[PDB]
Ligand binder design. Structure first.
Ligand SMILES: NC(=O)c1ccc[n+]([C@@H]2O[C@H](COP(=O)([O-])OP(=O)(O)OC[C@H]3O[C@@H](n4cnc5c(N)ncnc54)[C@H](O)[C@@H]3O)[C@@H](O)[C@H]2O)c1
Ligand SMILES: NC(=O)c1ccc[n+]([C@@H]2O[C@H](COP(=O)([O-])OP(=O)(O)OC[C@H]3O[C@@H](n4cnc5c(N)ncnc54)[C@H](O)[C@@H]3O)[C@@H](O)[C@H]2O)c1
Ligand SMILES: NC(=O)c1ccc[n+]([C@@H]2O[C@H](COP(=O)([O-])OP(=O)(O)OC[C@H]3O[C@@H](n4cnc5c(N)ncnc54)[C@H](O)[C@@H]3O)[C@@H](O)[C@H]2O)c1
Ligand SMILES: NC(=O)c1ccc[n+]([C@@H]2O[C@H](COP(=O)([O-])OP(=O)(O)OC[C@H]3O[C@@H](n4cnc5c(N)ncnc54)[C@H](O)[C@@H]3O)[C@@H](O)[C@H]2O)c1
Ligand SMILES: O=C(O)c1ccc(C(=O)O)o1
Ligand SMILES: O=C(O)c1ccc(C(=O)O)o1
Ligand SMILES: O=C(O)c1ccc(C(=O)O)o1
Ligand code: NA
Ligand code: NA
Ligand code: NA
Ligand code: NA
Lengths: 269, 268, 269, 269
């Protein structure tokens, strides 16, 4: 039975994760962390998510609680996540990564450690998004070669990274299905005189507003018609339940880099 | 090689685009066109109609008079007219691409029957995007359909006489079919007054009629916590027209049968 | 500081109102009521909305807590609301009425009491929706005569009525601004062969799905262009925030019958 | 009858303008221009827009055709438009400007010449958009102070400037109604780690794809709800008819800087 450590347990996602893990009857909330400076250190995890007392308190370092957990679920910040990844390599732990805003260099590192450590990494833990990735592949094979491809996303006012990890995942799925690398084609900004659109570019547009949990649209546009595939997230618990499910799934596995497509058995769709 | 095309209702919205599309397809010849006997456009050059010079082919009030001139009829008119053309095809060994929508169940049965003796393409939509969308709907329905609410919304221009659109119904059929169901067992086409709580299995249809909208379609798969929307937007009727001409070129070879755009595009 | 009494504090709206009043920094949650039968009598208001202990408990009669509050916010049932209105008259209090389903007789009584008591009454308390109604009037005056008008709405799977009361309110605002009665022009369903659209009809399309809190769009469509005005509700709290805003506004206002148009200053635009 | 000179008559807009001016019974198509390089110099204007033969040919300089026209309609490029504006000043002509992508310095210059030349300038010649500007003012007064404001637009693959002039016009209307300058608050791109959104920023997101004639959405987002005002253009003829109407209106007006709001009588909506 999976013992879970929630990194950054006081965060928007972290609180939902504690709750999701608590109510998943195949998982146990065994540990949680916060920034060393943070005041919420020493607080009961249950009191933090507003559901009684679990007898587990928030720590400033997961290395101190190594004997309590099997898997870390990490929706924090990239530097922090990399530390946890290092911790996993050293102590034989596993990790589910939700954090976004990694540089290309950092993702290379994650891939490397993933050869020794069991890792789930996805930019989105919802079923709908992972379905959408497969749908994008198919749309890209049929329409990609002669159509303009644009990705639009909206998120709440607190999101620190643009474009979102999910939007990038969408671009990668598309580019990958067309035998391309996203970074060869992506355009992340348009200001002033940009000239005519290039044929191959994948454009990204970003909206930051209110409490929007997450909207994503991929557009394939021809002269005379267009196809738009959209996902809208209503509740963070969707992501949280999905990540706890990935952790439960990951507990049974060897080293490797896994996606939610692997967890959900969506690879052949 | 060359397919000679007859465009039924050549002065119509679709008809004008079809003349143009057949002209531009290099494997096709615009050979004939028809209009209602009442119509003031009878005797007009087809080229003038779509604004592309003079073709030396004029609009007639009956395609039976031009039987020697064409191999395939492309028909986006009205159901009675289309049935008449279908009969013409049976009598004279011609082929037909049907775009017309708003057929009754009885009329669709007749079409299937004649399709046993005549080569027929019939599709709810002739665009590549829509046919792609149908395949995407199948996939979405297999993963999300059993647990999610399914709704179809469509918008069209103020002149459209049938609701919901043939395309929206085609989307419903693709979805229902992929889930091992019949669309008519689950479809709800109207909601007025107190309807009660939504049933789990129903597929809801909502219809918008406005302005000059060429065609928008959205299929929504909605769960508690998230939703997926797959949308198609048509900007130009040339999308439909090019696809139908492509179907006609394809159909010219062929023996008798009932064919879809899936058969034409090999998208199965 | 406006001291607020929330009638029917255990209700869907009531819980959100307690929370909204707590969060508004110009308002204090001072009292709350429930039906005398209710098992929630004597419960802390804060525990009720999961906001901690407020030191204020639910009572079965607001007359017992008269010294604690200035304004009542009432989203209950018509009989109960009329009782509170009477209470306001007797003890010199004010009221924000959210309750609907009054008979014409009852509305006449409300108007009578409103001569002596400060009263806000409206069919919708969301700032966005009230704003949208005003915008619809304007759009209808400029584009309504020659454009096709369509109203589209989406709601969750539990909504039993179609179209929604809000969608109808939108149709009424539009029709009213054009010197028409909605029921003369409205079309609520389209099935089979309907013929060409009429010039003056207002079409309604209704979507029922998932957990959608409420989306409304009004479209004005011409040949060559269209204008769409949309409201999206993300959380039912939005209505609660509007009513608390009305209560703050109503405080220290003299006797009168007021609407959300008065609260939002919507005539002075 | 107003004699119209169409600058850049072979362009997307230019061809529509020739056609629009031809069909407007109060206007006539008297002249048209193209780049001196252009192979369309010496071509009949009518043949260019596919409407028979007008007996008027495209020239490389409108100064040569001064005696043929009263008003120039200019949807070209900023340098070209400024040259035409200079021509108007010298020869006593009038101008309707559609061109977008002017710098703030260039707009100051336009304002200056507009003191002695009759000028209509707008980023959009459709009725719907000019309506939308007025609606945005109202929405900004009610929701702007406490909501996140985002503007999104889509256009076809050939558009060279981002964001669109219309999107900027929307931003200006909003900012202006709130007693702000757009350039103080506008954010035109978001890439990498941007941090949390500021309270006052107005975000712009830009989509370039296919044959999209023009879509614009302004969003006002709160916690719990959001309002979206959208305009969609279906045909360039909408813009073209509007500009020809402005030209007809402008003919015989005195010097001044005029908008479509003046032409349409929308100032006191
Ligand atoms: N993959 C997905 O499905 C998905 C879904 C939602 C959010 N996200 C991403 O997850 C991340 C979390 O977003 P959020 O809104 O929860 O952020 P947040 O700011 O609400 O929470 C992040 C938390 O991590 C904590 N933290 C930072 N550094 C730490 C360290 N060294 N040790 C322990 N704790 C630390 C912070 O104190 C904070 O409480 C973001 O990168 C976001 O983009 C991913
Ligand atoms: N399958 C698709 O992809 C698709 C796409 C567009 C339209 N449609 C359908 O195609 C049909 C045509 O639509 P439209 O918008 O072009 O309509 P329209 O009314 O503009 O044109 C139809 C034309 O058919 C002509 N017509 C009718 N009866 C006739 C007869 N007996 N002989 C000769 N001409 C006749 C009419 O006079 C008219 O000019 C509709 O049923 C519409 O729903 C289908
Ligand atoms: N104007 C608006 O924006 C708006 C929005 C939603 C609902 N409403 C209206 O508000 C009312 C309440 O809606 P709801 O969804 O909260 O209903 P609800 O049934 O969830 O809540 C009503 C509450 O009122 C309480 N109540 C009834 N009589 C009472 C009394 N005498 N004393 C104390 N409490 C009493 C009930 O116990 C219940 O808790 C309805 O009339 C509804 O039509 C208005
Ligand atoms: N205000 C509005 O309503 C509105 C609507 C549509 C487009 N626009 C704007 O109008 C402009 C035109 O866009 P378009 O899509 O028609 O572009 P386009 O490139 O298709 O057309 C521009 C034309 O102007 C010509 N031109 C350039 N310099 C010239 C010169 N010195 N003399 C003569 N001709 C010259 C070009 O050769 C070309 O034919 C853009 O700035 C666009 O943003 C404005
Ligand atoms: O895809 C993402 O990056 C993503 C999903 C959710 C969030 C967030 O809230 O920050 O970010
Ligand atoms: O799918 C359809 O029914 C459809 C597509 C387009 C039209 C139309 O113009 O009426 O109808
Ligand atoms: O607002 C604009 O800038 C605008 C309106 C139309 C176009 C275009 O076609 O490029 O650009
Ligand atoms: Na558990
Ligand atoms: Na041809
Ligand atoms: Na004219
Ligand atoms: Na200011």
């Amino acid at each position: 039975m999976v013992r879970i450590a929630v990194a950054g347990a006081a965060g928007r996602m972290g609180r939902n994760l504690v709750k999701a893990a608590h109510h998943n009857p195949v998982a146990k909330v065994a540990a949680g962390s916060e920034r060393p400076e943070s005041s919420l250190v020493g607080v009961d995890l249950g009191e933090l998510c507003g559901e009684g007392k679990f007898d587990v308190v928030v720590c400033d370092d997961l290395a101190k609680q190594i004997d309590q957990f099997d898997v870390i679920i990490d929706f924090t910040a990239p530097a922090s996540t990399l530390n946890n990844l290092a911790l996993c390599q050293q102590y034989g732990k596993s990790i589910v990564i939700g954090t976004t805003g990694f540089t290309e260099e950092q993702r290379e590192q994650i891939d490397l450690v993933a050869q020794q450590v069991p890792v789930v990494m996805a930019p989105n833990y919802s079923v709908g998004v992972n379905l959408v990735f497969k749908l994008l592949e198919k749309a890209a094979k049929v329409m990609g070669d002669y159509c303009d491809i644009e990705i639009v996303e909206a998120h709440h006012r607190h999101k620190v990274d643009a474009p979102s990890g999910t939007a990038i995942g969408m671009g990668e799925a598309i580019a990958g299905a067309m035998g391309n690398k996203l970074s060869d084609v992506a355009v992340y900004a348009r200001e002033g005189i940009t000239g005519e659109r290039t044929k191959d570019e994948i454009g990204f547009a970003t909206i930051r507003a209110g409490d929007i949990v997450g909207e994503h649209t991929a557009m394939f546009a021809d002269i005379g018609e267009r196809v738009e595939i959209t996902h809208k997230a209503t509740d963070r618990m969707t992501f949280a339940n999905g990540a706890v499910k990935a952790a439960v799934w990951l507990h049974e596995k060897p080293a490797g880099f896994y996606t939610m497509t692997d967890v959900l058995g969506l690879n052949d769709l």
